[PDB]
Amino acid sequence: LTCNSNDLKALEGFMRGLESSIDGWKWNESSSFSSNCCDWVGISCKSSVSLGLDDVNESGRVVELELGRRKLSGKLSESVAKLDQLKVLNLTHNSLSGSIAASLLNLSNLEVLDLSSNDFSGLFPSLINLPSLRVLNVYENSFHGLIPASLCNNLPRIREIDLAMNYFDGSIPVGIGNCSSVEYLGLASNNLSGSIPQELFQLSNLSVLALQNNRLSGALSSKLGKLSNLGRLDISSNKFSGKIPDVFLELNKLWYFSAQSNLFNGEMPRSLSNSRSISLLSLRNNTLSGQIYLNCSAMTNLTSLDLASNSFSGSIPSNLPNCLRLKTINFAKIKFIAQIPESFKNFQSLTSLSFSNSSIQNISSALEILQHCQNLKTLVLTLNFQKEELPSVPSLQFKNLKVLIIASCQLRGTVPQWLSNSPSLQLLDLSWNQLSGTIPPWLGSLNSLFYLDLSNNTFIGEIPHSLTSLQSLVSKPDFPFFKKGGLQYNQPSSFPPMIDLSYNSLNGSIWPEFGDLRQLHVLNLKNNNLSGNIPANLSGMTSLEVLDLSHNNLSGNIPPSLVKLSFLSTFSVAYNKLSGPIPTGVQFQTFPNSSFEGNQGLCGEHASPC
Amino acid sequence: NMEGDALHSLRANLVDPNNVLQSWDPTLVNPCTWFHVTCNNENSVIRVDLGNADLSGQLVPQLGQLKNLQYLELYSNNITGPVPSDLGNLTNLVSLDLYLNSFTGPIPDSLGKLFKLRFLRLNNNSLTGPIPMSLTNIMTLQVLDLSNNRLSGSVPDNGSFSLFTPISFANNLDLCGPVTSRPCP
Amino acid sequence: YIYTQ
Numbered sequence: 001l002t003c004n005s006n007d008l009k010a011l012e013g014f015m016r017g018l019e020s021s022i023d024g025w026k027w028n029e030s031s032s033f034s035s036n037c038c039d040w041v042g043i044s045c046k047s048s049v050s051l052g053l054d055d056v057n058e059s060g061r062v063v064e065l066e067l068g069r070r071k072l073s074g075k076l077s078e079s080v081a082k083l084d085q086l087k088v089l090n091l092t093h094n095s096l097s098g099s100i101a102a103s104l105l106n107l108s109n110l111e112v113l114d115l116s117s118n119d120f121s122g123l124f125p126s127l128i129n130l131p132s133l134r135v136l137n138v139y140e141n142s143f144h145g146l147i148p149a150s151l152c153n154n155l156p157r158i159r160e161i162d163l164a165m166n167y168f169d170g171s172i173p174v175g176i177g178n179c180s181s182v183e184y185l186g187l188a189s190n191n192l193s194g195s196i197p198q199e200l201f202q203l204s205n206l207s208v209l210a211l212q213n214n215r216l217s218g219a220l221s222s223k224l225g226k227l228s229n230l231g232r233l234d235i236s237s238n239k240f241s242g243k244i245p246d247v248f249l250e251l252n253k254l255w256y257f258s259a260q261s262n263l264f265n266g267e268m269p270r271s272l273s274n275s276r277s278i279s280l281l282s283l284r285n286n287t288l289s290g291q292i293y294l295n296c297s298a299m300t301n302l303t304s305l306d307l308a309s310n311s312f313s314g315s316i317p318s319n320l321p322n323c324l325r326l327k328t329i330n331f332a333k334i335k336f337i338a339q340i341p342e343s344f345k346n347f348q349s350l351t352s353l354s355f356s357n358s359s360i361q362n363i364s365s366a367l368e369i370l371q372h373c374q375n376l377k378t379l380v381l382t383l384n385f386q387k388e389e390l391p392s393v394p395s396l397q398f399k400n401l402k403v404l405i406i407a408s409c410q411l412r413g414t415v416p417q418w419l420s421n422s423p424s425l426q427l428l429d430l431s432w433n434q435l436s437g438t439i440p441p442w443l444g445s446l447n448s449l450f451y452l453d454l455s456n457n458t459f460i461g462e463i464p465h466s467l468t469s470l471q472s473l474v475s476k477p478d479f480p481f482f483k484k485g486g487l488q489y490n491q492p493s494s495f496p497p498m499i500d501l502s503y504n505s506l507n508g509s510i511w512p513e514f515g516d517l518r519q520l521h522v523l524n525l526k527n528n529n530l531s532g533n534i535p536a537n538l539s540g541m542t543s544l545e546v547l548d549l550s551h552n553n554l555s556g557n558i559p560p561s562l563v564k565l566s567f568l569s570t571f572s573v574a575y576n577k578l579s580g581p582i583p584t585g586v587q588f589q590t591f592p593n594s595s596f597e598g599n600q601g602l603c604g605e606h607a608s609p610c
Numbered sequence: 611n612m613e614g615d616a617l618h619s620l621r622a623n624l625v626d627p628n629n630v631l632q633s634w635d636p637t638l639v640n641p642c643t644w645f646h647v648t649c650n651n652e653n654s655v656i657r658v659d660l661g662n663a664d665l666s667g668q669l670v671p672q673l674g675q676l677k678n679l680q681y682l683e684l685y686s687n688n689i690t691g692p693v694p695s696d697l698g699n700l701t702n703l704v705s706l707d708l709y710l711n712s713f714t715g716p717i718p719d720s721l722g723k724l725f726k727l728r729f730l731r732l733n734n735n736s737l738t739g740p741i742p743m744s745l746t747n748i749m750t751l752q753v754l755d756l757s758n759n760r761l762s763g764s765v766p767d768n769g770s771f772s773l774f775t776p777i778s779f780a781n782n783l784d785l786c787g788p789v790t791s792r793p794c795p
Numbered sequence: 796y797i798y799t800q
């Protein structure tokens with residue numbers, strides 16, 4: 001109940017190290033807060049008698065200091081090591097900088113040390129005596145040089161070690177094998193190089209191992225089969241090489257394996273094709289070759305399978321619909337030059353499929369097959385079927401489809417009616433095709449659609465009024481997408497809401513009612529026949545980041561009300577019939593002179609004086 | 611990625627009742643797909659347009675880490691606290707708009723290290739103290755609005771201030787000079 | 796256009 005005096009003096013030292021005051025602590029001494037550190041917020045006391053301290057005084061001792069997310073700036077004072085009964089030290093997600101005193105790695109009672117997400121830098125202390133420590137987390141700091149070679153010599157009770165997101169360098173220390181009790185080891189996002197020391201495979205309680213994003217090299221030795229309790233392994237973004245060892249019968253708990261973006265080659269080992277455990281499998285962006293083979297009788301846990309961007313040859317495996325839990329497939333950038341097997345009509349587990357840039361052919365049968373997969377949510381056909389004809393058959397139905405992208409195929413035909421059988425469409429990309437006709441007004445009735453890309457086609461006619469009324473533009477496991485370097489979008493909600501009709505033949509004017517779409521981030525009308533006045537009411541699109549009207553026939557004035565778009569970063573009226581003063585609002589003054597070019601009668605700032 | 615970290619530091623420090631920062635996800639390899647951020651072709655942030663976003667909270671020094679930043683538009687919000695000196699580390703800035711906010715404290719002297727700056731608008735805040743002299747060194751500066759602050763001091767007509775007029779310094783605490791309406795004693 | 800890889 002009553003703060004120990006030495007503990008209080010240690011906490012007072014910690015306090016000066018900081019550049020700002022912690023609320024819930026009596027700080028300045030003009031503070032009206034309690035002088036008893038035990039009622040300070042983030043501090044937990046235990047009786048001296050419960051800690052087995054039999055001495056003359058009965059006082060509260062500080063066993064937990066938990067300051068996570070308190071917005072702390074300063075150093076970490078050495079005097080924190082004066083608190084000898086400390087069990088938990090949690091400083092996570094703060095601004096603290098400086099080095100870590102060796103003193104603090106000497107505390108005998110310490111159980112959790114969590115320093116993560118700070119500015120700590122310099123070398124990590126080489127002397128670790130922390131015989132009570134379950135958890136050591138330095139994730140996300142500025143530490144550099146070697147991981148301590150002696151790291152585990154004094155950590156007999158250790159459970160989680162996380163060094164990830166630092167500058168640590170060198171080979172993983174041969175002493176990493178003395179970590180015997182460890183379950184979690186994060187090394188990812190560092191400078192580590194050389195081979196994996198054979199001694200890593202002696203850690204028999206190892207459960208999760210994160211090695212991704214380093215320079216690790218050499219083969220991946222068969223000794224991996226020694227870690228039989230391993231459930232999750234990320235080897236991604238290193239440079240390893242050679243065949244993948246055929247150990248997967250030995251790792252019977254392994255549910256997660258990610259080797260992507262390495263130099264691996266040869267065929268996938270037989271045992272991996274047989275794993276009864278693996279759930280997520282990502283091999284993408286390696287040199288793997290041969291005919292893809294999975295025993296879907298053996299593979300009863302498979303859910304995410306990602307082979308994209310590999311050297312595979314032969315046929316699309318026709319037995320994959322026999323993997324009963326399999327949900328997502330990224331087959332992108334494997335060049336099959338075949339069509340989709342008839343048997344995919346039975347894939348009822350599949351929610352997401354990408355054949356992007358896989359040289360698939362006969363789109364007519366592709367859609368006829370794929371409509372029978374009831375659970376299809378995401379379908380990416382980009383860069384296939386080149387020059388074929390986008391089926392106009394009314395019969396096709398994808399009921400559950402959220403995302404449809406068939407882009408850059410040079411497809412011919414019109415926007416087909418069958419697409420209306422997907423009332424839940426959020427995202428539609430038909431861009432970069434030979435598609436013709438008029439954009440059908442029924443698109444307006446899609447109540448979930450927030451992203452529409454019709455760009456770089458032959459469409460003609462007017463923009464339909466109904467787009468003005470799209471419900472989701474009026475008001476408000478993993479399958480990465482990349483947008484043409486390409487930026488990565490993790491799910492559909494990551495794309496700014498968009499209407500991109502750019503690069504077509506559309507005639508007509510721009511409807512005033514666009515001002516009703518308050519959730520629209522991007523409007524791209526560039527490169528069309530659009531004529532008439534830019535409506536003042538565009539001012540009402542409050543969320544609009546990008547407004548591109550360039551290369552059209554538009555006449556009249558840029559409406560001064562466009563100053564009310566405060567989020568508008570990027571804008572072009574270039575090459576139109578436009579005339580009059582350019583709006584002087586703040587966003588406009590930051591637009592480049594090229595945004596207004598090719599309009600003779602435009603004047604004011606950005607042009608010749610009116 | 612360090613730029614993502616900088617802007618995320620800014621996010622943890624702001625207050626966003628309308629979720630305009632909802633798309634800002636620190637786990638991403640960079641922040642180019644984040645809404646309201648624009649990057650150049652080498653994928654480095656050249657714009658942040660947060661104007662009139664109902665944002666509250668405060669800035670952060672980490673803002674100073676965006677080496678290619680050009681336009682910082684924070685105007686018309688409720689952001690409070692100091693204007694960080696680290697802002698002076700942005701050499702490529704042509705526009706800094708902090709106006710119509712709640713900022714207090716003085717104006718960093720480091721602001722005079724922005725030699726490409728066209729637009730400086732700090733007007734309509736609570737800012738106090740003197741007007742940093744280095745600003746006269748910025749010859750590219752087209753617009754200056756310090757009006758409606760608590761500033762106190764002398765304002766020379768030398769250098770780039772020869773360009774400006776009393777409306778740029780109007781409605782302060784105690785300001786005098788030839789570029790102002792009141793001559794110094 | 797959007798693609799995956």
Ligand SMILES: *[C@@H]1O[C@H](CO)[C@@H](O)[C@H](O)[C@H]1NC(C)=O
Nearest residue numbers: 068069090092112114135137
């Ligand atoms: C540190 O505290 C945060 C809450 O601020 C918590 O989420 C995290 O689990 C703690 N770290 C450890 C190692 O317990």
Ligand SMILES: *[C@@H]1O[C@H](CO)[C@@H](O)[C@H](O)[C@H]1NC(C)=O
Nearest residue numbers: 149150153174175176177178
């Ligand atoms: C592993 O532990 C043993 C026994 O304590 C010791 O001989 C060896 O030096 C340790 N490993 C390293 C490299 O410190």
Ligand SMILES: *[C@@H]1O[C@H](CO)[C@@H](O)[C@H](O)[C@H]1NC(C)=O
Nearest residue numbers: 156179180181182203204205
């Ligand atoms: C690994 O697990 C078992 C049970 O969790 C335990 O008995 C043993 O202490 C652990 N192994 C080592 C090497 O400490």
Ligand SMILES: *[C@@H]1O[C@H](CO)[C@@H](O)[C@H](O)[C@H]1NC(C)=O
Nearest residue numbers: 237238261262263285286800
């Ligand atoms: C593919 O792997 C190589 C070599 O590891 C890497 O450098 C490259 O960035 C990877 N490509 C992608 C898009 O991940």
Ligand SMILES: *[C@@H]1O[C@H](CO)[C@@H](O)[C@H](O)[C@H]1NC(C)=O
Nearest residue numbers: 252253254255276277279301
């Ligand atoms: C299947 O995967 C799940 C996690 O998705 C995991 O809990 C389980 O261990 C795996 N099953 C087997 C048989 O290993």
Ligand SMILES: *[C@@H]1O[C@H](CO)[C@@H](O)[C@H](O)[C@H]1NC(C)=O
Nearest residue numbers: 273274294295296297298299
């Ligand atoms: C595939 O799996 C089943 C069940 O595991 C097994 O009995 C069968 O012989 C395997 N076939 C091959 C060719 O691996």
Ligand SMILES: *[C@@H]1O[C@H](CO)[C@@H](O)[C@H](O)[C@H]1NC(C)=O
Nearest residue numbers: 333356357383484798799800
């Ligand atoms: C498509 O594959 C081609 C040919 O193999 C390659 O040049 C190109 O990078 C790929 N494009 C995309 C977006 O995947």
Ligand SMILES: *[C@@H]1O[C@H](CO)[C@@H](O)[C@H](O)[C@H]1NC(C)=O
Nearest residue numbers: 408409410432433434456503
């Ligand atoms: C539009 O499409 C063709 C291929 O369909 C492509 O080569 C061209 O560069 C694209 N142009 C624009 C304006 O996007």
Ligand SMILES: *[C@@H]1O[C@H](CO)[C@@H](O)[C@H](O)[C@H]1NC(C)=O
Nearest residue numbers: 591592593594605606607608
């Ligand atoms: C744009 O052009 C006008 C005159 O045509 C000029 O005063 C202004 O400085 C130019 N803006 C830029 C940044 O080039």
Ligand SMILES: *[C@@H]1O[C@H](CO)[C@@H](O)[C@H](O)[C@H]1NC(C)=O
Nearest residue numbers: 743744746747766768769770
């Ligand atoms: C303007 O005068 C001030 C005050 O004496 C001085 O500090 C500053 O450097 C001068 N600027 C120029 C460019 O002459």
